[PDB]
Design a protein around this ligand. Structure first.
Ligand SMILES: NS(=O)(=O)c1ccc(C(=O)N2CCN(C(=O)c3ccccc3)CC2)cc1
Ligand SMILES: [Zn+2]
Length: 260
C-alpha cells in the first residue's frame, strides 16, 4: 500500500474511502450500531475461550493511523476459540481507536452511545496458514472489541501509555516484549457477535466481530497520552492522532447475536 493516501482528515477520511475501496459500500461493513433490544440471545453460541497465558509480545509500532502492539504468531501461543468461531484464531496484534474528547472515539456504538475508545485484539484463522491469506476469506479473522470509558485507571494499560513517548510519529517502533494482554480484559466475557469487515482500508469482509458488553475503565491521563501521538512522520507538521474511528455503517442483511 505504498500509494495509499486514506486517513481520518476532512479530505481523506471515511466518506472518501469508497473511491479507492468500493467495498466501503458493501453488504457486511463494520463497525455497526449494536441495538441492544433487537440483538437476540443465541443459546447455540459455544463458550468463548481467550487463551493468552503464552502470548509473546514483540514490538509497538505507530503506523500513522493508530499504534499496533504486535505478537509472535508463528506458533499457537495466544489464541481465541469458541463463541461463534469454528477452529482456532491466533492473536497477531492489538490496537485502539479513540477520540479528541471523551464523548467519542469508539467505532461500534451501543444504542447509539459512543465510548471514549475501542480496543481491537486481531486474530487470524489458522486453517489459512498466514494473515495475508486469512484476510481473503469470509471467516479469516476474529476481532475481539472492547470499549473504553474514562474513570479509574487500567493498571494493565500503563506499560502501553509509558512507551508512547518513544513512538510519537508515523513509522517509529519500539521493542515491547513481555506485555500481558490479559491485563486489558474486563471481568465478563459476555458479548455480541456479527459478520463484518476491517474498519480501515482495505475494508475486506473477512471478520467475525466479537464485541464485549462490559467496558474497561481507563483514566483521563491514560487517554490524554493517546491523544499526544501524531499521524504525521518526524519533521512534518504536527497533526494529533485523534478521531481515528470509522462511524457506524448500515447493518443491511445481518443479525447481531447476544451470548447472554
Ligand atoms: N480495525 S480492524 O481491527 O478492523 C483492523 C485490523 C487489521 C488491519 C490491518 O493491519 N491491515 C488491514 C488488512 N491487511 C491486508 O489486507 C494485507 C495487506 C498486505 C499484505 C498483507 C495483508 C493488513 C493491514 C486494519 C484494521
Ligand atoms: Zn481497529
Amino acid at each position: 500500500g505504498m500509494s495509499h493516501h486514506w486517513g481520518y482528515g476532512k479530505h481523506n477520511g471515511p466518506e472518501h474511502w469508497h473511491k479507492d475501496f468500493p467495498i466501503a459500500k458493501g453488504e457486511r461493513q463494520s463497525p455497526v450500531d449494536i441495538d441492544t433490544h433487537t440483538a437476540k440471545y443465541d443459546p447455540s453460541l459455544k463458550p468463548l475461550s481467550v487463551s493468552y497465558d503464552q502470548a509473546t509480545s514483540l514490538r509497538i509500532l505507530n503506523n500513522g493511523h493508530a499504534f499496533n502492539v504486535e505478537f509472535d504468531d508463528s506458533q499457537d501461543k495466544a489464541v481465541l476459540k469458541g463463541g461463534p468461531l469454528d477452529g482456532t484464531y491466533r492473536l497477531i496484534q492489538f490496537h485502539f481507536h479513540w477520540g479528541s474528547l471523551d464523548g467519542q472515539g469508539s467505532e461500534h456504538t451501543v444504542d447509539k452511545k459512543k465510548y471514549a475508545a475501542e480496543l481491537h485484539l486481531v486474530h487470524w484463522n489458522t486453517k489459512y496458514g498466514d494473515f495475508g491469506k486469512a484476510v481473503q476469506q469470509p471467516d479469516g479473522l476474529a476481532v475481539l472489541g472492547i470499549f473504553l470509558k474514562v474513570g479509574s485507571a487500567k493498571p494493565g494499560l500503563q506499560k502501553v501509555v509509558d512507551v508512547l513517548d518513544s513512538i510519537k510519529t508515523k513509522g517509529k517502533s519500539a521493542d515491547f516484549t513481555n506485555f500481558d494482554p490479559r491485563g486489558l480484559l474486563p471481568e465478563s466475557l459476555d458479548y455480541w457477535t456479527y459478520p463484518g469487515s476491517l474498519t480501515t482500508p482495505p475494508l475486506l469482509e473477512c471478520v467475525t466481530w466479537i464485541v464485549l458488553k462490559e467496558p474497561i475503565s481507563v483514566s483521563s491521563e491514560q487517554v490524554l497520552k493517546f491523544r499526544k501521538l501524531n499521524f504525521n512522520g518526524e519533521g512534518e507538521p504536527e497533526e494529533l492522532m485523534v478521531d481515528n474511528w470509522r462511524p457506524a455503517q448500515p447493518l443491511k442483511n445481518r443479525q447481531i447475536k447476544a451470548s447472554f
